[PDB]
Amino acid sequence: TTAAGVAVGSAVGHVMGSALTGAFSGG
Amino acid sequence: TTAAGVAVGSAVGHVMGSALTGAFSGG
Amino acid sequence: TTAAGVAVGSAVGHVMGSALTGAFSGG
Amino acid sequence: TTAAGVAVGSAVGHVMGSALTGAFSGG
Amino acid sequence: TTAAGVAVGSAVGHVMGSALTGAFSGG
Amino acid sequence: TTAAGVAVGSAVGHVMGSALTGAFSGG
Amino acid sequence: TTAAGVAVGSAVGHVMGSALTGAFSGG
Amino acid sequence: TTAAGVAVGSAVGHVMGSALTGAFSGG
Amino acid sequence: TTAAGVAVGSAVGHVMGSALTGAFSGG
Amino acid sequence: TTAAGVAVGSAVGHVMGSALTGAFSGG
Amino acid sequence: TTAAGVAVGSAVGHVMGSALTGAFSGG
Amino acid sequence: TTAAGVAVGSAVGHVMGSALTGAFSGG
Amino acid sequence: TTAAGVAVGSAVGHVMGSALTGAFSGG
Amino acid sequence: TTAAGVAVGSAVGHVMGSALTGAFSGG
Amino acid sequence: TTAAGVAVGSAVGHVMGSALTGAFSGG
Amino acid sequence: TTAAGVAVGSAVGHVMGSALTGAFSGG
Amino acid sequence: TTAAGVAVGSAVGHVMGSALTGAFSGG
Amino acid sequence: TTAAGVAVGSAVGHVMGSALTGAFSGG
Amino acid sequence: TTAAGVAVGSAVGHVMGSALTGAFSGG
Amino acid sequence: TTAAGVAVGSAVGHVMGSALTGAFSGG
Amino acid sequence: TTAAGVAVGSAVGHVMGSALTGAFSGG
Amino acid sequence: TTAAGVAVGSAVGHVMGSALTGAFSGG
Amino acid sequence: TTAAGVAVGSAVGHVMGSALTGAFSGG
Amino acid sequence: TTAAGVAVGSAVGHVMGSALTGAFSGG
Amino acid sequence: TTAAGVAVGSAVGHVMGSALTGAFSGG
Amino acid sequence: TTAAGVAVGSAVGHVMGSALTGAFSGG
Amino acid sequence: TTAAGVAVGSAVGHVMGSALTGAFSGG
Amino acid sequence: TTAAGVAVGSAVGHVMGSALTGAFSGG
Amino acid sequence: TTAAGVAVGSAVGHVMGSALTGAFSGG
Amino acid sequence: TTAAGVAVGSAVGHVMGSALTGAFSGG
Amino acid sequence: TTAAGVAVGSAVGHVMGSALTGAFSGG
Amino acid sequence: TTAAGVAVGSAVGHVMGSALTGAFSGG
Amino acid sequence: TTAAGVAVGSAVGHVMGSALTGAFSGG
Amino acid sequence: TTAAGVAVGSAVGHVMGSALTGAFSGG
Amino acid sequence: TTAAGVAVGSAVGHVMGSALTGAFSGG
Amino acid sequence: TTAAGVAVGSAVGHVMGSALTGAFSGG
């Protein structure tokens, strides 16, 4: 299984308690 | 299984308790 | 299993209690 | 299993209690 | 299992209690 | 198992109680 | 198991109670 | 098991109570 | 087991109570 | 004048001869 | 003058000769 | 004049002849 | 004039002849 | 004039003929 | 004029003919 | 004029004909 | 004029014909 | 004019025809 | 099967992601 | 099967990600 | 199977990630 | 199978990550 | 199988990560 | 299988990480 | 299998990490 | 198997980490 | 197996860490 | 005065007594 | 005065008594 | 006055009594 | 006056009584 | 006056009574 | 006046009565 | 006046009555 | 006046009545 | 006047009536 991604949060505000995963590939 | 994606949050406001995954590919 | 990703937080605000993973590949 | 990634936090604000992993590849 | 990554924190603010791992490859 | 990474902290602020590991490869 | 990495702290601020490991390879 | 790394602290600020290991290779 | 590393502290500030090991290779 | 933005390219394909500016604020 | 925006290209195809600006604020 | 931004290229493909500026603030 | 930004290239492909500037602030 | 930024290239591919500037602040 | 930045190249591939400047502050 | 930066090259590949400057501050 | 920086090359590959300057402060 | 820096080459590969200057302060 | 051809791209602009084949002769 | 051809790209602009084959003759 | 060809790139601009084959003759 | 060809890159710009083959003749 | 070719790169710019083969003749 | 070729790099710029083979003839 | 070739690098610039083989003839 | 070749490097610049083989003939 | 070759380095610059073999003939 | 052009002759037939100029710019 | 051009003759036939100039720039 | 060009003759046929100039720049 | 060029003759046929000049720059 | 060029003859046929000049720069 | 060039003859055929000059710089 | 060049003859055929000059610099 | 060059004859065939000068610098 | 050069004849065939001068510097 192949995964490809981009995860971008905010540009000015904060990031609190957040799961920013670019790509997930389970097995 | 192949996955491709882009996940973008806000540009000014915050991101709180959010799961921003670019791509998920389970097995 | 292959994973590729980019995870970017904020540009001005802080990052608090956040899991910024570029790519995850379980086994 | 292969993993590739980039994890970038903030540019101005702090990073507090955060797990910034560029790439994870379980076995 | 192969892992490759880059983990970058802040550029101005501090880094407190954070796990900045460039790449993790479990066995 | 092979691991490759880069871990960079802040450029102006301090680094306090932080685990900056360039690459981890368990056995 | 092979490990390769670079761990860089701050450029202006201090480093306090931090584990800066370039590469870890368990057995 | 092979390990290779570079660990660099600050350039202006101090280093206090910190474990700067270039490379660790357990057995 | 083979280990190779470089550990560099500060360039202006002091180094206090710090374990600067270039490379560790346990047996 | 204040500007805030996020510019994200592709997730799989390349980026060729492109001006990806997150935010522009002329004077 | 204030500007806020998000510009996202493709998710699979390439980006060629394109001006992806998140936000522009002239003076 | 204040500028804040994030510019992210591709996640798998290359970046060729591209001007990736996070934020521009002219004077 | 203040500028803040993040510029991230690819995660797998190369970067050729590209100007990756995190933030530009002219005078 | 103040500038703050982060510039990150690739994680697997090379970087050829590229100007990776974290922050530029002209006078 | 004040400048602060982080410039990181590749993690696996080479760096050829590239100008990696962490921060530039002209006068 | 003040400058602060971090410039990191590759972690596995070579560095050829490259200008890796942590911070530049002209006068 | 004040300059502060860190310049780190590769961790495994060579460094050929490269100008690795930690900080430059012209007059 | 004040300069402070750290310049570190490779950890395994050679250094050939390279100018590794920790800090330069012209007059 | 015989094939003869001439394929010419642009004279001023670039060529991006293009398959310029002078002649193709399948079997 | 016989093939004959000429493939010419640009005269001023670049060539990016392009397959310039003068002649192809499959079997 | 016989193949004959000429493949010419640019005259001023660069050539990035391009497959310039004068002639291909499969079997 | 016979192959004959000429592959010419640029005259002023660089050649990055390109496969310049004068002639290929598979078997 | 017979192969004949000429592969010429640039005349002013560099050649980076490129496979310049005059002629290839597989078996 | 017979191979004949000429591979010429640059005339002014450098050659970095490049495979310049005049002729290859596999068996 | 017979091979004949000429491989020429640069005339002014350097040659770094390059495999300049005049002719290769596998068995 | 017969091999014949000429491998010439630079005329002014250096040769670093390069494999200049005039002719290779495997068995 | 027969091999014949000429390997010539630079005429002005140095030769560092280079394998200059006139001809190699394995068995 | 600026000139840019491409001049291509035949692909199969000969070229006899012909002035093939890519670009002419008189003074 | 600036000139840029590409002049390509035939691919199969001969070139007899022909002036193939890539670019001419008189003074 | 500046000139840049590429002049390529035939790929199979001969070149007889021909003036193949890559670039001419009179004074 | 500046001149830059590439002049390439045939790939299979001969070159007889021909003036192959890469670049000419009169005074 | 500056001149830069590459002049390449044939790859299989002979060179008879030919003036192959890489670059000419009159005074 | 500066001159730089590369002149390469044939790879298989002979060179008879030919003036192969790499670079000429008159005075 | 400065001259730099490389002149290479054949790789298999002979060289008869030929003036192979690497660089000429008249006075 | 400065001259630098490399002159290489054949690799298999003879050299008869030939003037192989690496560099000439008249006065 | 300064001269530097390398003159190499054949590797297998003879050298008859030939003037092999590494460097000539007239007065």
Author numbering:
A (entry chain Z), B (entry chain h), C (entry chain d), D (entry chain J), E (entry chain B), F (entry chain F), ...: 50 to 76
Sentences from the paper on this structure:
Here, we demonstrate that the low complexity N-terminal domains of both D10 and D2, as well as the full-length proteins, can form amyloid fibrils in vitro and in vivo. Structures of D10 and D2 fibrils assembled in vitro from the low complexity N-terminal domains of each protein show that their core comprises the most highly conserved region between the two proteins.
Using cryo-EM, we observed several distinct D10-NT fibril polymorphs (see Methods section on Cryo-EM sample preparation and data collection) and determined three different structures. WT D10-NT polymorph-3, solved to 2.63 Å resolution, contains four identical PFs with yet a different fold (PF3) arranged as two helically symmetric dimers situated around a central pseudo-2-fold helical symmetry axis. The central interface is quite small, consisting primarily of residues M65 and G66, while the PF interface within each symmetric dimer is extensive and comprises strand 1 and the first half of the turn between strands 1 and 2. Interestingly, residue S59 is a small sidechain that is packed inside the PF interior in all three wildtype (WT) D10-NT structures, while residues V57 and G58 are found either in the PF interior or at PF packing interfaces in all three D10-NT structures.
